[PDB]
Design a protein around this nucleic acid. Structure first.
Ligand SMILES: [Mg+2]
Ligand SMILES: [Mg+2]
Ligand SMILES: [Mg+2]
Ligand SMILES: [Mg+2]
Ligand SMILES: [Mg+2]
Ligand SMILES: [Mg+2]
Ligand SMILES: [Mg+2]
Ligand SMILES: [Mg+2]
Ligand SMILES: [Mg+2]
Ligand SMILES: [Mg+2]
Ligand SMILES: [Mg+2]
Ligand SMILES: [Mg+2]
Ligand SMILES: [Mg+2]
Ligand SMILES: [Mg+2]
Ligand SMILES: [Mg+2]
Ligand SMILES: [Mg+2]
Ligand SMILES: [Mg+2]
Ligand SMILES: [Mg+2]
Ligand SMILES: [Mg+2]
Ligand SMILES: [Mg+2]
Ligand SMILES: [Mg+2]
Ligand SMILES: [Mg+2]
Ligand SMILES: [Mg+2]
Ligand SMILES: [Mg+2]
Ligand SMILES: [Mg+2]
Ligand SMILES: [Mg+2]
Ligand SMILES: [Mg+2]
Ligand SMILES: [Mg+2]
Ligand SMILES: [Mg+2]
Ligand SMILES: [Mg+2]
Ligand SMILES: [Mg+2]
Ligand SMILES: [Mg+2]
Ligand SMILES: [Mg+2]
Ligand SMILES: [Mg+2]
Ligand SMILES: [Mg+2]
Ligand SMILES: [Mg+2]
Ligand SMILES: [Mg+2]
Ligand SMILES: [Mg+2]
Ligand SMILES: [Mg+2]
Lengths: 149, 77
RNA sequence: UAAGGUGAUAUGAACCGUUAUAACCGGCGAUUUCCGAAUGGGGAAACCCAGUGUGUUUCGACACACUAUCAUUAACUGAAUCCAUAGGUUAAUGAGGCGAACCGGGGGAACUGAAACAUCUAAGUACCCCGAGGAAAAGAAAUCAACCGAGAUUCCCCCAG
RNA sequence: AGGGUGACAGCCCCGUACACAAAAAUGCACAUGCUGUGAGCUCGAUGAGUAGGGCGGGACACGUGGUAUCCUGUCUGAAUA
RNA sequence: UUUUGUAUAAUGGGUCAGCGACUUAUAUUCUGUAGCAAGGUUAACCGAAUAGGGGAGCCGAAGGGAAACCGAGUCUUAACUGGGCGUUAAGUUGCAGGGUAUAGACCCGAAACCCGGUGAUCUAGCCAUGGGCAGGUUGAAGGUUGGGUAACACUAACUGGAGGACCGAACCGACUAAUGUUGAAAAAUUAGCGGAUGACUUGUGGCUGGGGGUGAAAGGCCAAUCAAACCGGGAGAUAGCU
RNA sequence: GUUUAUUAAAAACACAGCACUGUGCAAACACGAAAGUGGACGUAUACGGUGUGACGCCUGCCCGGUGCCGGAAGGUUAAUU
RNA sequence: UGAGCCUUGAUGUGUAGGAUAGGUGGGAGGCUUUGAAGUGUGGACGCCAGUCUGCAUGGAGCCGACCUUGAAAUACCACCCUUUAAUGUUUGAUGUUCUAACGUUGACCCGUAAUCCGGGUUGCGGACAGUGUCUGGUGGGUAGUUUGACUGGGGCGGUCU
RNA sequence: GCUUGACUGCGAGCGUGACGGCGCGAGCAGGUGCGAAAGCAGGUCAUAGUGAUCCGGUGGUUCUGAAUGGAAGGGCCAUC
């Protein structure tokens, strides 16, 4: 009995996978507990339309994220004014809100969450490298100008 | 009675034919089973007296489609 | 429509009527006890016993009406269990039972014939059961034909013992 | 035609041929009112646990036969002008 | 009537009157008869309705061969000196009759088989609820007291009231004989007989249904004949028999 | 005690007693296509089937045949494939 | 765990010899501190010659036209063979367990002043049992029948062309 | 001794049967053996030694072949 899985079920497959199962497994367990649906010609189309709709929506987001990743490298140098004392040590720090709000006013609408700092929160006057999470795999760098106020 | 609630399959009559071709009246009964079907749309189990064939009809059409036929027939469940 | 009438055995009695409520014939109404589907409950048919609502120059008890079951629909209500669903009450509408044959369907003999008998026959007959109509059933080709063509179904005559 | 009348009646009586008749209810036709139903045109759509199959039966004049066709109790199971 | 053969002491009939058994339909062939004749005749139906229409068909004028096929011939065989069947006989449609076929098929008659009903008011077994058993006997267990014993055992008298116990009416049954046998009676009467507190007997009502019941079992009983009840139906079963 | 109501009352049937055998309870068994029921509101000291027939003294030998019970290695063997 | 497949690891005494020469190709540096040589020892194979390999120790090397040899370097890498082991997959077989079909003639709740039924909870079982279709065996329990004629009656014997 | 006449197709005319059948047969055609030849041979001195039909099997076949070409199945001949 051909069925298209709703959840992730052991030994069978994943969500939206078409598998042949024993009628009694589907009838008494998989279908009542909503883990699968019969692979009817109406539902095979409904799940291939959803497979094509998700593939097209994931390709466009990969296209929008790379347009954002090339816009991040385009700036190459962003200036942030911070009150720093003698020897270049900052009184405060340049955090995620500070880096994100500096690039949104510059052009690229980057979020606080998208910013990724290695160890510190920037407490020294000079130049530093700041990496970004635009997507789960796409990554782009910028150089931060710690200008003394 | 030995009637399938889905297909209407009921006992039919025919013959036992021996090697000597002696005909004796017999019956062919449907492969009936009382089965509890989970009806999602009603958040309830519905017990139907069904033949294994009628059970395959429910696998193909779906319980809601089959129960709709029972309502249209006036047949209660 | 009428000069005669009040059915019969069946007289008699007391009466009705004759120009138009005598009678008689036809159409439509009224009344139509009790038993019987029988239906308020019961029951050994023509009987026994109720509930509720109403009446009483007598408002005791009797009279009168309603109250069966099932199906569909609606309103109110309402569990296990939160919702729901089941269940419960009421109302509206329908059914029920009877009866010739023909008709569609579910079951389905045997004697008999085979000069015995089992395959076969009798015969899808007899019978039992369900359902329906003035008819029923069937019916507008996934039909035939034979390279030509026909054009639903039903019935009759041939083909042909 | 036929029946009756004290025996066998065209002309005695009731009829018969023919010609007619309804206040009322009802059947069937058309005409017509009303409630409900929908005509025509264009673009579509075209009946799946089905057809087919294995097993057991039944139906076909046809008794499984070399046996097509139909139905299906049981197990299965397509194509898509 | 049946028989080789019946006065036969074989069958049948008391007598009379009335009734009572070779039919009917459709096929088929033959004879008679009629029409038409190498043709004859239409069926359903139409109808102007016993007319007329309708020739769909059917029989016949051609056969031979399994057939293809050939054809006054053909088949057989490689082929027949031949041989088989044919060619030289008029048919067809009515009407009447003789036979046959399918039908109850000349009439009457089984014992039975199948189907659907009605019956446990008789009787069998059981279920519920009621009733009955005169009179007379026998005298179990147990108990008390006395004797006895170391104690028990044991023993006597009394008490006690068991039992499909005994004798015997009602009641239940039915062993023998006579009578009766077109009875008083489709199972009895009379004289005797067995049980008679029990596995007893009986009233009222209930339940089991026909290949079924019930049976302390005899194939007993299931409404006066039960090795398969009764009634209605298949039904005019069939009857090489009388 | 019972029995052939209506030609047989007996030596026949039954009987207490004995034995074999089945039956773990939704029992075996029996009436029922089934549901339901009896067995039994019982539970192996119980319930069914079969035979024998108080009691006393007893009940020997035979498993080849037929019936039954147990066995799984091999041979043969159905639908199915 | 039988049979097919898949990455990847083992395994090869013609003779000239550093020496138990795997065929054919990319073919001048690989293998290494994600730690070799050399020693100590465990296990497996075996033609007791020696190969593969685990762990410890050690610490700056085993190496190429370098000459043999039909055919080259244990510097390394790719399709594979002689054969063998083990991880992935397919349909079987066998076992263990599970719960969710199905059974419950355990207890409980509700419908419900109900030893039926239904729904619900819970416990016990559980893909067993049971049932449908098919199939082999058994089956006087039931059923329909057969079980000859001749004959100095019939039967027995004998006979039947 | 040599051989396959234990031939194939037919058959005037008879016999014996209720019938189904069974039997005897010279001669004709084709082909054959034996004999120099005339000739003889269609089993065995003769008379027993047998089983109808149906159904089915095998081989052969100018037959049939359900639209048509095939095929299946049927016919015919031989045989079980
Ligand atoms: Mg009543
Ligand atoms: Mg009443
Ligand atoms: Mg009452
Ligand atoms: Mg609630
Ligand atoms: Mg009615
Ligand atoms: Mg007969
Ligand atoms: Mg009517
Ligand atoms: Mg109609
Ligand atoms: Mg055309
Ligand atoms: Mg006179
Ligand atoms: Mg269509
Ligand atoms: Mg079809
Ligand atoms: Mg054949
Ligand atoms: Mg005589
Ligand atoms: Mg004389
Ligand atoms: Mg005489
Ligand atoms: Mg006499
Ligand atoms: Mg003639
Ligand atoms: Mg006594
Ligand atoms: Mg007496
Ligand atoms: Mg005495
Ligand atoms: Mg006495
Ligand atoms: Mg009584
Ligand atoms: Mg008859
Ligand atoms: Mg008769
Ligand atoms: Mg006695
Ligand atoms: Mg007697
Ligand atoms: Mg007597
Ligand atoms: Mg005895
Ligand atoms: Mg003995
Ligand atoms: Mg055994
Ligand atoms: Mg099983
Ligand atoms: Mg079978
Ligand atoms: Mg047997
Ligand atoms: Mg018998
Ligand atoms: Mg018979
Ligand atoms: Mg005889
Ligand atoms: Mg010569
Ligand atoms: Mg053809």
């Amino acid at each position: 009995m051909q069925v298209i899985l709703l959840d992730k079920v052991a030994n069978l497959g994943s969500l939206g996978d078409q598998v042949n199962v024993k009628a009694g497994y589907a009838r008494n367990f998989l279908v009542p507990q909503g883990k699968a649906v019969p692979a009817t010609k109406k539902n095979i189309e409904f799940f291939e339309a959803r497979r094509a709709e998700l593939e097209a929506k994931l390709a466009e987001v990969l296209a929008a994220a790379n347009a954002r990743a090339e816009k991040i490298n385009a700036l190459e140098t962003v200036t942030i004014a911070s009150k720093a004392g003698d020897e270049g040590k900052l009184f405060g720090s340049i955090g995620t809100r500070d880096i994100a709000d500096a690039v949104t006013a510059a052009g690229v609408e980057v979020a606080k969450s998208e910013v990724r700092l290695p160890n510190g929160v920037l407490r020294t006057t000079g130049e530093h490298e700041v990496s970004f999470q635009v997507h789960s795999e796409v990554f782009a760098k910028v150089i931060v100008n710690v200008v003394a106020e | 009675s030995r009637v399938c609630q889905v297909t209407g399959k009921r006992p039919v009559t025919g013959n036992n034919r021996s090697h000597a071709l002696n005909a004796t009246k017999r019956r062919f009964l449907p492969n009936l089973h009382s089965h509890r079907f989970w009806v999602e749309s009603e958040k309830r189990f519905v017990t139907l007296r069904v033949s294994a064939k009628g059970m395959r009809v429910i696998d193909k059409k779906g319980i809601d489609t089959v129960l709709a036929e029972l309502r249209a027939r006036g047949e209660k469940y």
